[PDB]
Design a protein around this ligand. Structure first.
Ligand SMILES: *C(=O)[C@H]([C@@H](C)O)[C@H]1C[C@@H](SCC/N=C/N)C(C(=O)O)=N1
Ligand SMILES: *C(=O)[C@H]([C@@H](C)O)[C@H]1C[C@@H](SCC/N=C\N)C(C(=O)O)=N1
Ligand SMILES: [Br-]
Ligand SMILES: [Br-]
Ligand SMILES: [Br-]
Ligand SMILES: [Br-]
Ligand SMILES: [Br-]
Lengths: 236, 235
């Protein structure tokens, strides 16, 4: 619908010698805001943000029975400690456990994965890491709004379970449901944070990506998004 | 002399795809604020902001008798229309009439210019392409002496220059200020320095910003005012 460029948010990026985009969508007012309309509409690899639709499809097809089912560690030690243990959907999403999601994708199969992504109108195996799938910030928001309103073609149940699994932060002021991403297999190397802020009276959808040349800057994904949310008085 | 960085003002620069510093000084609270403590303390060529001390010295030495004395156009046409006419101190300051100020400087002479700038503790054609340099915070320090009539020149000299600095006034505020554009030496910068008089307080300000072309000159005032609006110093 209607979009507005707010170049003042660029200050949040330059303060950290960083480049990227934040996109906000005010659900009540049906209005979007971004520091960079062009980058807002540039498609990148989803990386770990692909765990949202992967989770939805796995649940809807019964590849994942529920958020309690245990996926046993395969015993192969990997360089992220949190991966080297048993997981359920909740902890697999929280710790971005690629091995668990690769197994989901194999059991889903490329034919069913394709029909589901087409039905989700999601962007355009390992394809979400080093393959052809691409999605923009504004496309992330468009997908997330369908998930929020249970409007994706999968069961309501599938959508409620994934939204539970997206829980990141909650207090008396706000709830954040979101997914982090880090795309390194193809240039440019970017960090993602996509999801939404639930308030008493409104929802603010958000999608941000930023240049991530090294691991060191990963915290800026959350820190820069929150600086924008603070500035717009969406959270304290 | 306590200073505080307020990085939120950087929004006013980035909104205009621009880089620079604004420095504010709250006279009542004796506190300063800037978006960039480092750039606040970087010295640049004063350019037309040098007309403030040049005016003060010219008046104190009797090179300029008063704000009404006429400086006759020398008849040489220059690329700034407003320069191609007679001027007094008021219009020479308003239109930044370099030829008038060069004549002041010649009659002052380098010896008296030097002793006066030392007595003013001012910074470290010389103000355009020479050795004189001043920071935003040094501008504020000089302007506060002018405001309080504490520069070593006559009170009269100081009142006349403050009159000549008048830029804008209404029922909300008075601005006394001088614009500058430094182009002879890199980096090319715009200046706006002066103060905002309110009923109960004075806010000193000094801003400079990268000015690669003529196109952005209005941002000197526009960005300073966005900061003054945000801090609720003016509506
Ligand atoms: C999601 O964005 C994941 C999270 C851990 O940052 C990344 C992990 C990579 S594969 C493993 C690379 N790092 C190993 N130490 C990934 C992907 O390539 O899509 N998602
Ligand atoms: C002050 O900053 C001046 C205003 C007009 O922008 C600016 C003009 C330049 S050119 C000097 C003119 N040369 C001969 N008449 C200038 C400077 O060079 O310092 N200041
Ligand atoms: Br929940
Ligand atoms: Br991640
Ligand atoms: Br007098
Ligand atoms: Br006056
Ligand atoms: Br000027």
């Amino acid at each position: 619908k209607e979009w507005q460029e707010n170049k003042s948010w660029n200050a949040h990026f330059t303060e950290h010698k960083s480049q990227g985009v934040v996109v906000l969508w005010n659900e009540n007012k049906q209005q979007g805001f971004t520091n960079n309309l062009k980058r807002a509409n540039q498609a990148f690899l989803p990386a770990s943000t692909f765990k949202i639709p992967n989770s939805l499809i796995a649940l809807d097809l019964g590849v994942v029975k529920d958020e309690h089912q245990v996926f046993k560690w395969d015993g192969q030690t990997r360089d992220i400690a949190t991966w080297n243990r048993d997981h359920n959907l909740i902890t697999a999403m929280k710790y971005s456990v690629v091995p668990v999601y690769q197994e989901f994708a194999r059991q889903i199969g490329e034919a069913r994965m394709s029909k589901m992504l087409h039905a989700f109108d999601y962007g355009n195996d390992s394809f979400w890491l080093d393959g052809g799938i691409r999605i923009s910030a504004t496309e992330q928001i468009s997908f997330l709004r369908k998930l929020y309103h249970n409007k994706l073609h999968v069961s309501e149940r599938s959508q409620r379970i994934v939204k539970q699994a997206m829980l990141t932060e909650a207090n008396g002021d706000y709830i954040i449901r979101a997914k982090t991403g880090y795309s390194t297999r193809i240039e440019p190397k970017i960090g993602w944070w996509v999801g939404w802020v639930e308030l008493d009276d409104n929802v603010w959808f958000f999608a941000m990506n930023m240049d991530m040349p090294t691991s060191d800057g990963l915290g800026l994904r959350q820190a820069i998004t929150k600086e924008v949310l603070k500035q717009e008085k969406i959270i304290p």
